[PDB]
Amino acid sequence: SSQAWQPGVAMPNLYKMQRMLLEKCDLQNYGDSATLPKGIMMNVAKYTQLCQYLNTLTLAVPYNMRVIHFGAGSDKGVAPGTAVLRQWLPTGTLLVDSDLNDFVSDADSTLIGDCATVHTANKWDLIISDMYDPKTKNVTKENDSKEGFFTYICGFIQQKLALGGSVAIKITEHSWNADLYKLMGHFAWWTAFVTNVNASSSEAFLIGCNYLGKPREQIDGYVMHANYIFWRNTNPIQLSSYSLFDMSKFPLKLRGTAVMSLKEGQINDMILSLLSKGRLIIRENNRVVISSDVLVNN
């Protein structure tokens, strides 16, 4: 259908409501490839389509928006996705990125080290993660919920995401975490989004839209990942680069979303209503200070 002209495909709600058993992911289009525009990296195309899809959600976009990007390096030593985020985000957005290995970046600030070493004084309006460990891709082992950087991300969302903020966390068949799916219930809305350029992969971005700071719905993350694999297993997605050729409405519209410093008592239902609509960010508006813990050794 018309899906090939979208940036990608989001998990249909009816699949979220199932109670499937975890199965091996076996994609019909496995090994196919999209025809990328000449000279364009896979991850530029992939981040472009993710941002094109994010353009369709009720993201809060304050002045002096704060964005942090985990897993931003590559074996190329550069940061393709960071360049796309920098292009997508309004000018003046503070963009911090990070990776285990060293790389050169267009971000305003870059931290090298395990994500577990990263600390920030402030809260963030948008968290992007493309962290991935290729060792998870093992078809000879049970596919259990994974810890590692996923444990950090879950804590980082609960401690350092502003109310009304949003996240996009990359998962695969084997690179996933049950508590992250459970956390998706603490947003006004959530999905798993598959880009059209990488639709032959079990990769999706777990997108939590408008953080509420408490469970809106109870999600079992083992069941929901099984639900996600079932959707991917039974819905072949046609590989497509089409949306990459129309960049005229790409930039995220600077909405000037209100930022307010409220304490837990004053968050009433009307406030939660504004958060759910993309119309309020709750956090302090002090200075952005970050750091990376260094272990000292002989």
Partner 1 sequence: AFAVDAAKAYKDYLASGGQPITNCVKMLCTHTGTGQAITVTPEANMDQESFGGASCCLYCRCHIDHPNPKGFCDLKGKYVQIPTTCANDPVGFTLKNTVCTVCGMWKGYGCSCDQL
Ligand X SMILES: C[S@@+](CC[C@H](N)C(=O)[O-])C[C@H]1O[C@@H](n2cnc3c(N)ncnc32)[C@H](O)[C@@H]1O
Give contact residues for ligand X (rule: CB under 6 A): 43, 71-74, 79-81, 99-101, 114-115, 130-133, 148-149
- Complex with ligand X: residue 131 or 281, whichever CB lies closer: 131
User: Rule CB under 8 A: is residue 44 a binding residue for partner 1?
Assistant: yes
Q: How many residues bind partner 1 (CB under 8 A)?
A: 28
* Helix H or strand E encompassing 292: strand 290-292
**Per the residue annotation, which of 16, 123, 160, 170 is the catalytic one?**
170
**Per the residue annotation, which of 97, 99, 125, 203 is the catalytic one?**
203
Cα separation, 235 vs 196, whole angstroms: 13
Whether 126 and 166 have beta carbons less than 8 Å apart is answered as: yes
**Per the residue annotation, which of 46, 123, 160, 182 is the catalytic one?**
46
User: Rule CB under 8 A: is residue 220 a binding residue for partner 1?
Assistant: no
Whether 80 and 74 have beta carbons less than 8 Å apart is answered as: yes
80-97: b or e for each residue (b if 16 or more CB lie within 10 Å)?
bbbbbbbbbbbeebbbbb
Among ligand X, partner 1, none, residue 133 binds (CB under 5-8 Å by kind): ligand X
Whether 69 and 98 have beta carbons less than 8 Å apart is answered as: yes
Instruction: Return the beta strands (E) in the chain as ranges.
Output: 8-10, 66-70, 94-99, 109-112, 118-120, 124-129, 161-171, 187-195, 204-211, 258-260, 280-282, 290-292
Tell me the closest approach of the beta carbon of residue 64 to partner 1, in angstroms: 15
- What are 282's two structure tokens? 């709750």
Whether 72 and 99 have beta carbons less than 8 Å apart is answered as: yes
Sign of CA dihedral 183, 85, 134, 239: positive
Cα separation, 51 vs 31, whole angstroms: 25
User: Rule CB under 8 A: is residue 35 a binding residue for partner 1?
Assistant: no
Residues 52-81 that bind partner 1 (CB under 8 A): 76-80
Among partner 1, ligand X, none, residue 106 binds (CB under 5-8 Å by kind): partner 1
**Which residue in 37, 155, 215, 256 binds partner 1 (CB under 8 A)?**
37
**Catalytic: 97?**
no
Among ligand X, partner 1, none, residue 248 binds (CB under 5-8 Å by kind): partner 1
Among ligand X, partner 1, none, residue 239 binds (CB under 5-8 Å by kind): none
**Catalytic: 123?**
no
Tell me the closest approach of the beta carbon of residue 85 to partner 1, in angstroms: 11
- Of the chain, the end-to-end C-alpha distance in Å amounts to 60
Helices and strands (DSSP H and E) totals, the chain:
7, 12
- Complex with ligand X: residue 106 or 133, whichever CB lies closer: 133
**Catalytic: 170?**
yes
Cα separation, 73 vs 85, whole angstroms: 13
Among partner 1, ligand X, none, residue 178 binds (CB under 5-8 Å by kind): none
Cα separation, 32 vs 270, whole angstroms: 48
- Complex with partner 1: residue 76 or 277, whichever CB lies closer: 76
- Complex with partner 1: residue 4 or 42, whichever CB lies closer: 42
**Catalytic: 263?**
no
Residues of this chain that interact with partner 1 (CB under 8 A) are 37, 39-41, 44-45, 48, 76-80, 82-84, 86-87, 91, 104-108, 244, 247-248, 250-251
Catalytic residue set: 46, 130, 170, 203
